[PDB]
């Protein structure tokens, strides 16, 4: 490659138009949200589970935790490789 220059200005003149972030709630688009309707009935919530503590993750992106197996993030680690002695040497 030589040096392909693709720079189409920037157009930061009127950026973040916003448009109040709203023009969807006008009958037509709420049908697409309601498209499905019937999902997971049962007497309870499917009795093949060990416990019903929270079978369905109702909790969203509230700060930390969230429910999906991952959470956390901010670490430091390393220090002097004092970690639990069960580590694969994989750089």
């Amino acid at each position: 490659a030589r040096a392909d220059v693709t720079l189409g200005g920037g157009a930061k003149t009127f950026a973040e138009t916003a448009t109040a972030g709203e023009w969807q709630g006008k009958t037509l688009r709420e049908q697409a949200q309601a498209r499905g309707y019937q999902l997971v009935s049962d007497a309870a919530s499917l009795n093949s589970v060990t416990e019903a503590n929270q079978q369905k993750p109702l909790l969203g992106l509230f700060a930390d935790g969230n429910m999906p197996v991952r959470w956390l993030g901010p670490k430091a680690t390393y220090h002097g490789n004092i970690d639990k002695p069960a580590v694969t040497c994989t750089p």
Binding site: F14, E22, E51, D64, M67, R70, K75, I82, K84
Partner: protein
């Protein structure tokens, strides 16, 4: 072997391992005698030809294969008995390899410095005693119903958080710009969607009047030539639309998991779950403030190799989230990563020393404690713990958090933990 300790770059120490011909010609010959046995030619080799002939002459090709064996094992042997602990990665500068002469190779690698710890008692770390009170429970449920509310066209009065339809026309800074004109325009006010002040022009009105307001665009706007401007818009107030709150009937409330129709079960749900997330959030809260104050009150130079490592992890993660670029990120501007990476290893050295001194660990009962609190909160603990221990990406994260928690809390034992009492709103009022 003549080994040195040439502290050149301070962190960068050079152990020039000068493997003499006694260790060269023996270790090369160790492989050569094994080659005969590995191909079973030793059974045919009467020993008539002395090993020296096939070691220097025929083994000349194989002496290259033994170079890495010499550089690796004799290095790790040397630095342990020399009490020199490395950091990052070692650079082998092979001076020369010859028969008769000495296999001299200058291994230049960086080590840990004397980690200066100071004012660790002077560090004032905030401890927010946050919990989900009845104010927070009712507030939570109300917010859920308002965010999932169906838009009902009404007339009579604009409320502060409604969805109001207008036709606004004008110009920004008295000059032609887009976005300063929208017919049949609609605005979910009270929500972080549009300018605070634009909505208030409407909020001082009812249903179907007509007026003109001056909106001052914020310095919060990333729009560089718009931020702090005053635009003149002729607001033709049309209608209002209420955020009409949805049902909480048996089939609705069970769909989220709350099998019981009693709202007190959803209140109990908000308590037990949001506190499960909350303890981890408060741990990371007090942690991040402790780390902020720790490094702000402390200084230590980092081995460049460790900074390179952290920068590189950031480059991989960046490219992955930028599009999915494979090793292209190696070229990304280092100074974007330099400061924060080095700073995170400064955290790792300061925590490294307080850990060392207080003999800290990835505490088995802490890891397992959090594993039960984790898994039991789900549908099926069993397969979550099985998947977890096998998901090394996350099993790492579990060790790392346990160690980081205990590391920071050892500094909190030293530091001024300024505790305060507050509601669950505290954790949510963290914008900037």
């Amino acid at each position: 072997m003549q080994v040195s300790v040439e502290t050149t770059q301070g962190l960068g120490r050079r152990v020039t391992i000068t493997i003499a011909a006694d260790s060269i010609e023996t270790a090369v010959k160790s492989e050569l005698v094994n080659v005969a046995k590995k191909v079973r030619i030793d059974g045919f080799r009467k020993g008539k030809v002395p090993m020296n002939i096939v070691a220097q002459r025929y083994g000349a090709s194989v002496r290259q294969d033994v170079l890495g064996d010499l550089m690796s094992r004799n290095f790790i042997d040397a630095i342990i008995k020399e009490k020199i602990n490395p950091a990052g990665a070692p650079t082998y500068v092979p001076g020369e390899y010859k028969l008769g002469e000495d296999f001299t190779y200058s291994v230049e690698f960086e080590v840990y410095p004397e980690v200066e710890l100071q004012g660790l008692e002077a560090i004032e770390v905030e401890k927010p005693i946050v919990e989900v009170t009845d104010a927070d429970v009712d507030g939570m449920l109300d917010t859920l119903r308002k965010q999932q509310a169906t838009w009902k066209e009404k007339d009579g009065a604009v409320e502060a958080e409604d969805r109001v339809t207008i036709d606004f026309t004008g110009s920004v800074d008295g000059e032609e710009f887009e976005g300063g004109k929208a017919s049949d325009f609609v605005l979910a006010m009270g929500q972080g969607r549009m300018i605070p002040g634009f909505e208030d022009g409407i909020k001082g009105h009812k249903a179907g009047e007509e007026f003109t307001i001056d909106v001052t665009f914020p310095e919060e706007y990333h729009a560089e030539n718009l931020k702090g401007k005053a635009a003149k818009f002729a607001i033709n107030l049309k209608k209002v639309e209420e955020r009409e709150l949805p049902e909480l009937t048996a089939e609705f409330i069970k769909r989220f998991g709350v099998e019981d129709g009693s709202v007190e079960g959803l209140r109990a749900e908000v308590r037990k779950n949001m506190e499960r997330e909350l303890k981890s959030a408060i741990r990371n809260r007090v942690k991040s403030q402790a780390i902020e104050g720790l490094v702000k009150a402390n200084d230590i130079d980092v081995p460049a190799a460790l900074i390179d490592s952290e920068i590189d992890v950031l480059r991989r993660q960046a490219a992955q989230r930028f599009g999915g670029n494979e090793k292209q990120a190696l070229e990304l501007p280092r100074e974007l990563f330099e400061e924060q990476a080095k700073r995170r290893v400064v955290v790792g050295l300061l925590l490294g020393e307080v850990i060392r001194t207080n003999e800290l660990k990835a505490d088995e009962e802490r890891v397992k404690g959090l594993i039960e609190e984790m898994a039991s909160a789900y549908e099926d603990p069993k397969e979550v713990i099985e998947f977890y221990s096998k998901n090394k990406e996350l099993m790492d994260n579990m060790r790392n958090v346990a160690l980081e928690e205990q590391a920071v809390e050892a500094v909190l034992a030293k530091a001024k933990v300024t505790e305060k009492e507050t509601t669950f709103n505290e954790l949510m009022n963290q914008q900037a």
